[PDB]
RNA sequence: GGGGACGGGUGAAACAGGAUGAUCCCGCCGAGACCGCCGGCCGCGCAGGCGCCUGCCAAGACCGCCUCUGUCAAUCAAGGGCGAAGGCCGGGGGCUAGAAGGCGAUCAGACACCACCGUAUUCCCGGCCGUAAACGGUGCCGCCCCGCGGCCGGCGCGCGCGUCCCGCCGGCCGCCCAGGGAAACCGGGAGGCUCCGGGCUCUGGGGGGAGUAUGGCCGCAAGGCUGAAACUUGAAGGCAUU
């Protein structure tokens, strides 16, 4: 168990090669791209990546809209709700 | 602070034979 | 325009050298309002000062 | 192929016949297979809708947002990219946005949005490691990778061009008025070099 | 009688007295210290503001405003809060000169809970 | 030498408290430590106050009174001489003075 | 700022009480007037909610959203796994979750 | 005004004043008069002078007691222009700063609760109520701290009484409840029966929703003293 | 929108802002930070620390009790957790201040203090880091120990009867007789100690060299933790008096 000591858990591929600084940033994508998120819908923990920007849940075979690695962007959360109390206070 | 700033280049004289050493390895 | 104010009270003189007196004007000629204005040079009550220029009052606040 | 953010196939009634007819959006993040989408001047502000502008409220962000009335899109089209509404001069109908650039647009109150953030967002985060990626997302745009360096080509390529050491020669800086075989390095530029801010 | 707000303002650095419509959106006169004086040391100071609201008052005469509901300011926000040298000045030219008031009133914006203020934590060390 | 059985400062059952700042130095001070004096001093003075009521056109009009807590530095308020150096018995004898 | 019912209640339901997790079991117990309150969740999938609250209207028996989740319905029923509907049959005590 | 009968200055030359009239619930309604530009055409004087807010103390609309209304100032914004006179619409209420600075003490307790509340009218307006705690008649300690059981009582009190007092009143009739102070006063019967209270009263109401077309509420609230009763 | 020449800034200045109309006033509009006055010899938390509405989620002391258990304890290497700020790796954000930097001044020189501008930072999440005058500069568990009051949290004794009195208190505190100390001062201990011994764990042995050298461990780094010797030298230091 845990066979790399280090944050070399995904990056283990790339070998002794492209530099410690891009191997740390692509553990952090590569591990939130093909992490499984929770649809707002299934409320399953099934949605994987498809392609850039659209997720699929599994179970609730629902496709929705994402951020390229993770399905909801920090961006997109804050907007949301600036759309929604923005939306309250115009009704 | 003279202290403060006694530490601080105690510091540097440190880094500087770490890194020196380095060179000579 | 100048106007005619008489000293109420000598009050103790300031100025850092002692030099100029504190001195409280009733313009005698209208509405005697006992203004402080200060003054150098030697004064006692009753010397009427002639001047006014009634922008401005005096600072004996401590 | 060539557009990192998701596109979504909307399928509305057609108003003009009897059949449905499909309309192509770029897509906000959050919107689902499924999902209503309304297009019209009386429409709720959820993500998806398209409204004119003047109806989105200050403070709102929007995306493929059209620059002239009935232009069907033009500004904030990339992925994660988005416009926000600024302000609102209801005596001029015209409404302030403020580009993804930052630079501050007067539009037509009439231009309409699709509310939220176009999707893909974070897309450029991930390093792209290797040349192999580079060429393969380049593959799917136009044939501009891989770049050779004008120092690198020979005296009669490029105006950088070649001597004895690879050197710019002359300032990379030229006029905006430069011949159009001569504008190669920086063009117009205000100011050059890094620095704070 | 007829009344407008003052809207008086002293704070270090400068006074301003500004007469307005009642409502805020329209003004009358707006002469400040500064305008009267030659020296920047004394802009805030009790004279040159006497002078300022002098020529002040002769616009609110034109405009006929005959009092005047004063709103006196001081910078206020994350620092100040206590009113300048020529704030007394301002009113005691109107009451003198005869503008009737009816309505003194403080208007400092005064922060509930303030961001950060300029200096450091050793504060302006002079 | 502990100078102060408080150490300068009335934070007791405590490990941290607000910081504020002097109103003139602008430097950040404990809340415990800083001078905290309350004024509530009215807004024009009592000379302009018999001028203002009599030009006043509204009945039962009183002078607003402003209230402010001044809060200065130990540095600030000593030499501003909001507070003073006392006696080594004095500096143990508290109350307004 | 600004569950006596909402959290402990469904417990009490769960400890003493005939509850029906899950959609089909509901459907049935409504369709018989067997449920006394019927408990949605926020992620309920939109027909499912529609058909479930026309029934309950021709059944008269009240239907209530949980705070949301399915997910969240679950844990309060102590379960491990999702419930987009419950039906309580018979109820322990205290029905505070009908809020009028 | 000095410029349709008056020469006045160069910029004021062109600028009328129309007079600004408040609500019937006040028994002197002239707030006073507002100057605008004479219409060029591209701008009509009234649609500038349409929307304009002011602050008018309640000691000066409703004229007498000054112990009592001078320290409440009410907000009230022209939403219409009639013949002229621009009839102004409630914008909400202020308690001065010389009232709000006198009410803090040290060695006291503040409890201050906000709350908004829906009107019959569409409106929406945030009530903002402060309240303080009094040391008792006979009581040996100084301080007038309370402990947190009547802190939470007395919370719920503001909360209750406002919404049993103010649950579906309509605007004209919260404007005139607040210019009686009853809404002060039915505060305090509930606040004194747990504890003394050094001062229980609305600090300022705020309007988060304002319905379109407010031409029946202006009718309503300033056009008749008969429908303000 | 109005109305109009300066505005700023200061110890005095100067640099930037303003007839493309600034400052100023009011009306809005949006972000981000922050929770003012109440706010304390107040309270709470293991410390670090803790303040909008504080819904709802688990806890924690304290007090009360003829509830229950029956030595289940105290302190602790090794080992674990937590840990202000600054920093760091990587996102989110970005208003305000503002390490860098740039610019006025100020000086003999300031490249410093004072203006003005401003990057990192400051805020949020996910990890690091492991330090602070992290201080009550005072380890923890006990036992006794004199008066005089205050404050907060329970609980009783009574009394016309009031957030009154009187206790028991659990803590937070002031003052102090003995007692202690080199004294300052502690006296809810720093007392019960040359008349020297309840228990436990840590730390120091004249000053430098030196928290350096070297080895280890830990960290991405910055560093942290452990930790000398050669050599040199008569004082360094405490609290008080004039």
Request: proline residues 4%; aromatic residues 6%; charged residues 30%.
């Given at each position: 168990?845990?066979?790399?000591?280090?944050?070399?858990?995904?990056?283990?591929?790339?070998?002794?090669?492209?530099?410690?600084?891009?191997?740390?940033?692509?553990?952090?994508?590569?591990?939130?791209?093909?992490?499984?998120?929770?649809?707002?819908?299934?409320?399953?923990?099934?949605?994987?990546?498809?392609?850039?920007?659209?997720?699929?849940?599994?179970?609730?075979?629902?496709?929705?809209?994402?951020?390229?690695?993770?399905?909801?962007?920090?961006?997109?959360?804050?907007?949301?709700?600036?759309?929604?109390?923005?939306?309250?206070?115009?009704? | 602070?003279?202290?403060?700033?006694?530490?601080?280049?105690?510091?540097?004289?440190?880094?500087?034979?770490?890194?020196?050493?380095?060179?000579?390895? | 325009?100048?106007?005619?104010?008489?000293?109420?009270?000598?009050?103790?003189?300031?100025?850092?050298?002692?030099?100029?007196?504190?001195?409280?004007?009733?313009?005698?000629?209208?509405?005697?309002?006992?203004?402080?204005?200060?003054?150098?040079?030697?004064?006692?009550?009753?010397?009427?000062?002639?001047?006014?220029?009634?922008?401005?009052?005096?600072?004996?606040?401590? | 192929?060539?557009?990192?953010?998701?596109?979504?196939?909307?399928?509305?009634?057609?108003?003009r016949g009897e059949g449905r007819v499909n309309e192509l959006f770029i897509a906000p993040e959050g919107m689902y297979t499924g999902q209503e989408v309304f297009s019209g001047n009386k429409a709720t502000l959820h993500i998806g809708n398209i409204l004119p502008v003047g109806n989105i409220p200050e403070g709102t962000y929007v995306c493929n947002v059209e620059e002239k009335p009935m232009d069907r899109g033009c500004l904030a089209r990339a992925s994660g990219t988005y416009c926000l509404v600024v302000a609102h001069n209801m005596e001029t109908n015209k409404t302030r946005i403020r580009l993804p650039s930052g630079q501050k647009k007067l539009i037509s109150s009439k231009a309409r949005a699709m509310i939220g953030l176009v999707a893909g967002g974070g897309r450029t985060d991930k390093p792209l490691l290797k040349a192999g990626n580079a060429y393969h997302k380049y593959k799917a745009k136009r044939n501009c990778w891989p770049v050779v360096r004008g120092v690198a080509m020979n005296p009669v390529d490029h105006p950088h061009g070649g001597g004895n050491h690879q050197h710019i020669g002359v300032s990379s800086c030229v006029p905006r008025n430069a011949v159009p075989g001569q504008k190669v390095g920086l063009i117009a530029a205000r100011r050059t070099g890094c620095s704070g801010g | 009688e007829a009344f407008a707000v003052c809207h008086i303002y002293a704070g270090k650095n400068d006074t301003f007295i500004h007469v307005t419509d009642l409502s805020g959106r329209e003004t009358i006169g707006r002469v400040s210290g500064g305008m009267k004086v030659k020296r920047h040391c004394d802009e805030p100071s009790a004279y040159a503001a006497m002078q300022a609201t002098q020529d002040l008052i002769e616009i609110i005469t034109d405009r006929g405003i005959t009092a005047v509901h004063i709103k006196i300011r001081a910078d206020g926000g994350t620092?100040?809060?206590?009113?300048?040298?020529?704030?007394?000045?301002?009113?005691?030219?109107?009451?003198?000169?005869?503008?009737?008031?009816?309505?003194?009133?403080?208007?400092?914006?005064?922060?509930?809970?303030?961001?950060?203020?300029?200096?450091?934590?050793?504060?302006?060390?002079? | 030498?502990?100078?102060?059985?408080?150490?300068?400062?009335?934070?007791?059952?405590?490990?941290?408290?607000?910081?504020?700042?002097?109103?003139?130095?602008?430097?950040?001070?404990?809340?415990?430590?800083?001078?905290?004096?309350?004024?509530?001093?009215?807004?024009?003075?009592?000379?302009?106050?018999?001028?203002?009521?009599?030009?006043?056109?509204?009945?039962?009009?009183?002078?607003?009174?402003?209230?402010?807590?001044?809060?200065?530095?130990?540095?600030?308020?000593?030499?501003?001489?909001?507070?003073?150096?006392?006696?080594?018995?004095?500096?143990?004898?508290?109350?307004?003075? | 700022?600004?569950?006596?019912?909402?959290?402990?209640?469904?417990?009490?339901?769960?400890?003493?009480?005939?509850?029906?997790?899950?959609?089909?079991?509901?459907?049935?117990?409504?369709?018989?007037?067997?449920?006394?309150?019927?408990?949605?969740?926020?992620?309920?999938?939109?027909?499912?909610?529609?058909?479930?609250?026309?029934?309950?209207?021709?059944?008269?028996?009240?239907?209530?959203?949980?705070?949301?989740?399915?997910?969240?319905?679950?844990?309060?029923?102590?379960?491990?796994?999702?419930?987009?509907?419950?039906?309580?049959?018979?109820?322990?005590?205290?029905?505070?979750?009908?809020?009028? | 005004?000095?410029?349709?009968?008056?020469?006045?200055?160069?910029?004021?030359?062109?600028?009328?004043?129309?007079?600004?009239?408040?609500?019937?619930?006040?028994?002197?309604?002239?707030?006073?008069?507002?100057?605008?530009?004479?219409?060029?055409?591209?701008?009509?004087?009234?649609?500038?002078?349409?929307?304009?807010?002011?602050?008018?103390?309640?000691?000066?609309?409703?004229?007498?007691?000054?112990?009592?209304?001078?320290?409440?100032?009410?907000?009230?914004?022209?939403?219409?222009?009639?013949?002229?006179?621009?009839?102004?619409?409630?914008?909400?209420?202020?308690?001065?700063?010389?009232?709000?600075?006198?009410?803090?003490?040290?060695?006291?307790?503040?409890?201050?609760?906000?709350?908004?509340?829906?009107?019959?009218?569409?409106?929406?307006?945030?009530?903002?109520?402060?309240?303080?705690?009094?040391?008792?008649?006979?009581?040996?300690?100084?301080?007038?701290?309370?402990?947190?059981?009547?802190?939470?009582?007395?919370?719920?009190?503001?909360?209750?009484?406002?919404?049993?007092?103010?649950?579906?009143?309509?605007?004209?009739?919260?404007?005139?409840?607040?210019?009686?102070?009853?809404?002060?006063?039915?505060?305090?019967?509930?606040?004194?029966?747990?504890?003394?209270?050094?001062?229980?009263?609305?600090?300022?109401?705020?309007?988060?929703?304002?319905?379109?077309?407010?031409?029946?509420?202006?009718?309503?609230?300033?056009?008749?003293?008969?429908?303000?009763?």
């Open positions: 168990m845990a066979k790399r000591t280090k944050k070399v858990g995904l990056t283990g591929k790339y070998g002794t090669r492209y530099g410690r600084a891009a191997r740390k940033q692509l553990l952090k994508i590569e591990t939130s791209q093909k992490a499984k998120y929770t649809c707002p819908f299934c409320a399953k923990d099934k949605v994987r990546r498809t392609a850039c920007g659209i997720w699929t849940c599994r179970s609730c075979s629902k496709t929705m809209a994402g951020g390229a690695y993770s399905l909801h962007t920090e961006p997109a959360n804050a907007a949301r709700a600036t759309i929604r109390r923005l939306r309250l206070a115009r009704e | 602070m003279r202290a403060k700033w006694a530490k601080k280049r105690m510091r540097k004289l440190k880094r500087k034979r770490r890194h020196m050493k380095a060179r000579s390895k | 325009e100048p106007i005619n104010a008489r000293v109420i009270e000598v009050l103790g003189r300031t100025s850092s050298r002692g030099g100029i007196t504190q001195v409280k004007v009733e313009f005698m000629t209208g509405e005697k309002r006992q203004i402080i204005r200060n003054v150098i040079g030697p004064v006692r009550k009753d010397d009427i000062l002639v001047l006014m220029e009634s922008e401005r009052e005096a600072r004996r606040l401590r | 192929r060539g557009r990192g953010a998701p596109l979504a196939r909307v399928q509305f009634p057609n108003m | 620092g100040k809060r206590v009113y300048g040298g020529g704030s007394a000045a301002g009113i005691r030219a109107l009451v003198r000169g005869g503008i009737k008031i009816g309505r003194i009133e403080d208007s400092t914006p005064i922060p509930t809970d303030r961001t950060r203020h300029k200096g450091g934590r050793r504060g302006r060390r002079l | 030498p502990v100078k102060r059985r408080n150490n300068g400062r009335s934070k007791y059952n405590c490990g941290h408290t607000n910081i504020v700042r002097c109103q003139n130095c602008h430097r950040c001070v404990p809340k415990d430590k800083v001078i905290k004096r309350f004024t509530i001093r009215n807004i024009v003075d009592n000379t302009i106050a018999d001028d203002v009521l009599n030009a006043c056109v509204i009945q039962g009009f009183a002078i607003p009174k402003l209230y402010n807590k001044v809060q200065y530095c130990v540095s600030c308020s000593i030499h501003n001489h909001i507070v003073r150096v006392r006696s080594r018995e004095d500096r143990k004898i508290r109350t307004p003075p | 700022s600004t569950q006596d019912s909402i959290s402990l209640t469904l417990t009490l339901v769960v400890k003493s009480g005939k509850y029906t997790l899950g959609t089909d079991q509901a459907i049935r117990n409504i369709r018989d007037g067997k449920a006394q309150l019927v408990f949605m969740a926020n992620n309920c999938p939109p027909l499912v909610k529609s058909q479930v609250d026309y029934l309950c209207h021709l059944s008269k028996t009240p239907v209530r959203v949980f705070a949301g989740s399915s997910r969240e319905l679950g844990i309060a029923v102590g379960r491990q796994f999702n419930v987009s509907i419950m039906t309580i049959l018979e109820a322990g005590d205290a029905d505070l979750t009908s809020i009028l | 005004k000095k410029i349709t009968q008056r020469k006045n200055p160069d910029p004021y030359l062109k600028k009328e004043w129309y007079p600004v009239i408040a609500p019937a619930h006040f028994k002197s309604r002239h707030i006073g008069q507002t100057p605008v530009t004479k219409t060029a055409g591209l701008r009509v004087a009234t649609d500038v002078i349409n929307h304009r807010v002011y602050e008018v103390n309640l000691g000066d609309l409703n004229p007498g007691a000054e112990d009592l209304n001078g320290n409440t100032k009410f907000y009230l914004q022209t939403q219409l222009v009639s013949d002229g006179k621009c009839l102004t619409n409630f914008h909400g209420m202020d308690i001065t700063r010389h009232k709000y600075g006198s009410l803090f003490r040290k060695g006291c307790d503040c409890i201050d609760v906000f709350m908004d509340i829906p009107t019959t009218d569409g409106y929406l307006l945030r009530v903002f109520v402060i309240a303080f705690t009094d040391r008792f008649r006979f009581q040996r300690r100084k301080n007038c701290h309370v402990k947190g059981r009547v802190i939470r009582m007395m919370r719920a009190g503001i909360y209750e009484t406002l919404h049993n007092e103010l649950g579906k009143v309509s605007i004209p009739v919260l404007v005139t409840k607040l210019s009686n102070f009853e809404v002060n006063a039915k505060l305090t019967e509930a606040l004194q029966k747990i504890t003394m209270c050094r001062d229980v009263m609305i600090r300022r109401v705020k309007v988060v929703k304002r319905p379109r077309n407010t031409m029946e509420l202006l009718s309503t609230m300033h056009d008749s003293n008969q429908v303000r009763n």
